[PDB]
Amino acid sequence: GYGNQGGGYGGGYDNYGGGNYGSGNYNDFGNYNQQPSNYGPMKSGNFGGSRNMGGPY
Amino acid sequence: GYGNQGGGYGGGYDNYGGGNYGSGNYNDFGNYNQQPSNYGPMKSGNFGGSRNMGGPY
Amino acid sequence: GYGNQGGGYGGGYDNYGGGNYGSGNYNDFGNYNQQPSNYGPMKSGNFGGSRNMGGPY
Amino acid sequence: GYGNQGGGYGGGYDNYGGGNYGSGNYNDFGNYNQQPSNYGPMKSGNFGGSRNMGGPY
Amino acid sequence: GYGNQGGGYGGGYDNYGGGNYGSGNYNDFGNYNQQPSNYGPMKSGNFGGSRNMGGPY
């Protein structure tokens, strides 16, 4: 039984290439750029996992 | 039983390549750039795991 | 029984490549760059684990 | 019984490659860079483990 | 019984490669760099372990 009557199966997440993958924010400051900046804060939610908040049993 | 009536199965997370993977933020300051900066704080949520906050048993 | 009626199974997390993997933030200062800086604090949430905060038994 | 009615099973975390892995922050100062700096403090949450904060028994 | 009605099973954490692994912060000062610095303090949360803070028995 895979998470029946509940969270189930998160899935299959496979990365075979470079660059960013997931929930984290990605700042690529490029090529030959003159003074690039962000000034922006970054908050990235949770990655994967299994969480049960089910009601009374 | 895999997390039935509860959190279930987080899943399969496999990384076969470089670069960032997950929830952490990624700053790539590039190539031949003149004074690149961020000024942005970074907060990254949780990676994987199993959490139970279920009600009364 | 794998975390039935509770947290369940966190999952399978496998890293076969370089670069960052997880919840920590990644600063890559690049190639041939002129004075790259961050100025941004980094806080990274928890990695994996099993946590029970279930109600009364 | 693996963490049934509770925290469950944290999961499988396997690292077969270099680079960073986990919750610690990663500063890579790159290649041929002119005066790279961070100025950013780093705080990294917990890695793995099992924690019970369950209610009254 | 593995942490049933409680913390459960922390999991399997196996490192077969170099680089950083865990919750400690990683400063890699790179290759052929001109005066790289950090200026950033590093605080790293707990690694593994089992903790019980359960309510009244």
Numbering used by the authors:
A (entry chain C), B (entry chain B), C (entry chain A), D (entry chain E), E (entry chain D): 263 to 319
Sentences copied from the publication:
The protein hnRNPA2 functions in RNA stabilization, splicing, trafficking, and translation. In its role in protecting mRNAs, it is a component of cytoplasmic stress granules, one of the so-called membraneless organelles (MLOs). Its 341 amino-acid-residue sequence contains an RNA-binding domain (RBD) with two RNA recognition motifs (RRMs) and a 161-residue C-terminal low-complexity domain (LCD). The LCD is rich in Gly, Tyr, Phe, Asn, and Asp residues, and poor in hydrophobes, with Val, Ala, Leu, and Ile entirely absent.
